[PDB]
């Protein structure tokens, strides 16, 4: 028995979620609605043509001023900047995908429940500790149907947590730091312009732009043994999608690169299959575009210095790979629904 879904914010994340879900062979989700500010004309066009994903093979059409069609499946399009006006009760909306990035606290996110929706799934870190956070392949087992509002974490935390988990079990972690060399996002300005963060203000395709990240501390939400053990930053570089995590950890049990790669390979062929991948080919960022996995370990880059300083480089598609996790977590809510 499938569950009825609404997508709030038809952005990079909302559209990637639709194409991720649409391409699944078997699903318990049925997307019926999309709150989109630009109406049917925007939602239908940007859904069909995409500068990073490419052209959607499915058939996209505008049925009328309130609806679009994907391969004949009708979808209601609504438009309210204020979520309280959204028709969640009338359309019997079980689950919302909150991809706007504005309604990420419990007050704002609750409005979708208030407008009659049964559950909310934040496509980002929540802004309060009261909202439970999950990473598929790490702690999705701990999700309970009683949780009305859930967080699927950051794209970077989705890359970091699965391989951090393996390191923690196999070698044990004392402390560490990370750098995400991350593709530019819609938050950065195209040319130098207004922004509360004076780095993110600078022309994105011209510059290496340092920015703060919560992925290093956020890992502790899904892996309690990591509490206070990691910090880090990000460097936004002029690529439109695909990112890489550079992790330096001090480990308890002295090791070597081949032993650290064997641990990742055990996890990849076993319990983290589909989430963690170990790549042995000497590839580049574009080769990781549209990968389904959360993290791809660059095997040849793994480096151990002085027996216990371990460096791991992990590729992730921050749009698509994260979207394939958002479809996974939503499926867990569908599988658990009362």
């Amino acid at each position: 028995k499938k569950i009825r879904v609404a997508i709030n914010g038809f952005g990079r994340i909302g559209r990637n979620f639709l194409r991720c879900w649409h391409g699944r062979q078997n699903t318990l989700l049925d997307v019926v609605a999309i709150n989109d500010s630009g109406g049917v004309k925007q939602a239908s066009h940007l859904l069909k043509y995409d500068s990073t994903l490419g052209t959607f093979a499915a058939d996209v059409k505008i049925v009328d001023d309130s609806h679009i069609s994907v391969d004949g499946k009708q979808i209601k399009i609504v438009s309210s900047r204020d979520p309280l006006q959204l028709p969640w009760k009338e359309m019997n909306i079980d689950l919302v995908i909150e991809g706007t990035g504005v309604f990420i606290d419990k007050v704002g996110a609750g409005k979708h429940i208030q407008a009659g929706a049964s559950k909310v799934l934040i496509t980002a870190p929540a802004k309060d500790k009261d909202i439970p956070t999950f990473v598929v392949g790490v702690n999705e087992g701990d999700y309970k149907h009683e949780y009305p509002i859930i967080s699927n974490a950051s794209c970077t935390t989705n890359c970091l947590a699965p391989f951090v988990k393996v390191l923690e079990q196999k070698f044990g972690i004392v402390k560490g730091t990370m750098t995400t060399t991350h593709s530019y996002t819609g938050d950065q300005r195209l040319l130098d312009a207004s922004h509360r963060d004076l780095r993110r203000a600078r022309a994105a395709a011209l510059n290496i732009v340092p920015t703060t990240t919560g992925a290093a501390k956020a890992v502790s939400l899904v892996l309690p043994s990591l509490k206070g053990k990691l910090n880090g930053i990000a460097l936004r570089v002029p690529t439109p999608t695909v990112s890489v995590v550079d992790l330096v950890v001090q480990v308890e049990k002295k090791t070597f690169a081949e032993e650290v790669n064997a641990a990742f390979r055990e996890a990849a062929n076993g319990p983290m299959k589909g989430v963690l991948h170990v790549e042995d080919a000497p590839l580049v960022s574009i080769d990781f575009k549209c990968t389904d996995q959360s993290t791809s370990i660059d095997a040849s880059l793994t480096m151990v210095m002085g027996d216990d300083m371990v460096k791991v480089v992990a590729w992730y598609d921050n749009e698509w790979g994260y979207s394939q996790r958002v479809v996974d977590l939503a499926e867990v809510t569908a599988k658990k629904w009362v």
Copy 2:
């Protein structure tokens, strides 16, 4: 002499301050800047520029509402509503409208309600009755009696001066143009919401066709050209400098060397500093921070079938346009009261 206010401290407002600050002789005294970001944003973005490079000038935050450039202070007002702005109080003669939001008599009009005597719009006027000027083409028809004026678009400022030579020397039957244009702030960094589904597309990944009023707009500064020119823009992945590609059927049969000589006459005399003729085989980045409106690529000038003229002209859409903005505002200074 005249006391200038800058509304909207974006690429054109910040280009205007650096251009004006670089004039040896200036009749303009920039006293106020309206920026939402406050002294801390304005000081930072004036000083660090991804395109322009670091301002050589000493820029500091004096207090909560003032910055100094080489010790000269400027007030930072912060209202999205022009009607609020204290220009009666600050005795503001002229206002530079770099917001792109107040483009009509009513929108532009609000600055004058607030005390300013005149408005200079760094963009085409939305309203017909607003006179538009291109320095080196029709700035002579400028009059103090005009309270709200337009400095046209960056593309129109590149096109109008060379079109002017062509119409004088050969005469124009009709013509079409393409501007291969550097991306701008209108465009989205990644595919996102936009009225223009083309401008919605990732700016740094694409050649993005878009509309241009620049061809028809030439008829505003050269009335002889009404209904003769049309064109499009191809926005491409460069942060500044753009190039106009014009194809015109002309009345007087001609050849490449003869067209270039006509441009060179104008370059050396009446349009010096507005029109340049470039002989070296350069690329867009070499036209960065050029003060001229138009740089004819002399070797690209082509004539086919005697009367079909193709001209390729470079322009820094930020810096060259901004130098013309400084020039139009200076003209209102020399014609003031």
Copy 3:
């Protein structure tokens, strides 16, 4: 009865030719060899992973120091900078695809015949008038098996000639000029460096770089009525693939945009089906990536000024669309072979 093919120069064109051909449902070609300077390791890697085409779905493997495998089909890899040493006689090589761009005159190209090859197919304009030039959908009918050496023209001439043909038949052309706003190529330098052309010397991804083009005069080789009627230039901009032709022609019969688009639509639905396309969606360069057609008319951009000045904007994928023509022309030689 299929013909045996060798690819000389496993560059952007050689590799695009292999993937174009490999993806054809029915073909009379059987690629058996590739002269590649970088040996099996280069040819196998760059064939599998591609920054513009993306990852090849087929199975690519190195069988030994002289061979690679594509989906189990074995291919001999050789390496001679000097074509005279190539094993064309011993491998019974009927047809060579000359994609090096160095052996494009009749003396250099003949060396592949001299080394025992039966025919040569230059992936570029030939440097002498003695080598016949063909454009599929315009003049491929005039190709004769007796022609040992053939030219498939430039990517730009492949975009220009099909739509120029329609204009010439329907309205008749007096004179015109073109601009190709073209993606950067391997000929341009990444950073400012040595080049005989001081424009092409300048950093390609930083600049709009003017360059000479023979596509405007080259059109007269396939459409003799165009002789001396067109000239033009190119502007190389910082995109890695996909280009656009901006054509301004003076026509005899006075017309309007909708009439000019109707002519292109008649050709597209009729005799130029698969080569000429009319696009009504407001798209951008990336949307034309990996298109099979030689030319896609941007319908909404078509413009007529003063009754007889006509402007047409035509998108073309200079790598893939051109490669789908190179596979087409090679098929015509296979279909005509004695």
Copy 4:
């Protein structure tokens, strides 16, 4: 005073001429340039630069084998073989090896066979016995008796000075580094032939992991660091400026403010002009055309678990490295004979 020859007029050779030409006081006199492109290529690429911008200097072609910069002539020899070069005839004291092709005693040695007394390699030495120097770290150990010397790599020049402070003040146990590096000439514009299958990939489209000797190379100028440091490079789509990300376990437990103060001590005194400490929140392009080797991003300095130090340092891999090349060559001038 000393008569300098530049072999290989690429990004480093052209950066060297502009850097040297900008020194108020110089003991160097650049008399000859070996460029395959001839006076017409050298004059053009010295004058027009996609990164550096237009040379303010007057550059002209005097004749078939000479260019003038601000009237000073330079001879343009054109031989791929250094053994051919007429440096006995031109009385060439020092040769700047910017080709990247003659990196060993034998390859570098050919310039001296041809008449030159000394060779300065703008890259790591292929041969062990060739001494390498980093200005602000170990240039004091420089001696005239060394006929062939190395100025190390751009990354090593960024790393070595701040590593030096860390080893003095806190001491280094072991450490790893990543340099997020601007693309270079080694890399291909579109996927094409390369020994390094990663460097084969389109430079402006990708984050491209590559090897670096920069971590181990620090042990050449700081012998205390042997076997303590390793690293990689991520080449990214920017034309210049790069940033070193170093994580080191140190002996003396410490905190962010204490590490930054140690860098600031070095910046204000012994490493002034080699090491800078930046407090403003800048981006890579703001570090363009900086003369310093290293720019510490003060706010990014992080200390985790008391003894794991992360430092983020900017460097213009072209211009800052080139200013160090000018500095090493100057040192051979002040120690000459």
